[PDB]
């Protein structure tokens, strides 16, 4: 069926840096076929806010962060792949497809 991916980009610099990580992880997850919803936390504010439903649907989560995100508690109970916000930009596609083949391998 239609699987789901979410992410959280949180930067000490602010939302501009989180949007580079957001755009990157988004493209990657779109090529993976499923849904993608990425919340962005920074000193400027929070954009593209995830819902309790988004985090529940999420077969995959990526906390692409450099600081502890204020909303990390919502994902405490859930399966999160917590990396650096920089890895989200340089390795965007690599991250998503690696989580895909790790989960798929144990789901076979």
Swiss-Prot record:
The entry's free-text remark on domains says: The PTS EIIB type-2 domain is phosphorylated by phospho-EIIA on a cysteinyl residue. Then, it transfers the phosphoryl group to the sugar substrate concomitantly with the sugar uptake processed by the PTS EIIC type-2 domain.
- The residues responsible for catalysis, as annotated, are 11
Q: Where in the cell is it found?
A: Cytoplasm
Q: Which Pfam families match?
A: PTS_IIB (PF02302)
What role does it play?
The phosphoenolpyruvate-dependent sugar phosphotransferase system (sugar PTS), a major carbohydrate active transport system, catalyzes the phosphorylation of incoming sugar substrates concomitantly with their translocation across the cell membrane. The enzyme II FryABC PTS system is involved in fructose transport.
Q: Residues where Phosphocysteine occurs? A: 11
Q: Could you tell me the EC number(s) of this protein? A: 2.7.1.202
| Membrane spanning residue stretches | none
Q: Which GO terms describe its molecular function?
A: kinase activity; protein-N(PI)-phosphohistidine-fructose phosphotransferase system transporter activity; protein-phosphocysteine-D-fructose-phosphotransferase system transporter activity
Q: Under what name is this protein listed?
A: PTS system fructose-like EIIB component 1
């Amino acid at each position: 069926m239609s699987k789901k991916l979410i992410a959280l980009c949180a930067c000490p610099m602010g939302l501009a840096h989180t949007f580079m990580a957001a755009q990157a992880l988004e493209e990657a997850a779109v090529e993976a076929g499923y849904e993608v919803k990425i919340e962005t936390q920074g000193a400027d504010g929070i954009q593209n806010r995830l819902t309790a439903q988004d985090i529940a649907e999420a077969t995959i989560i990526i906390h692409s962060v450099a600081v502890t995100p204020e909303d990390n508690e919502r994902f405490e109970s859930r399966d999160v792949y917590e990396i650096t916000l920089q890895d989200a930009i340089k390795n965007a596609a690599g991250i998503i497809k690696e989580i895909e083949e790790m989960i798929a391998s144990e789901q076979q």
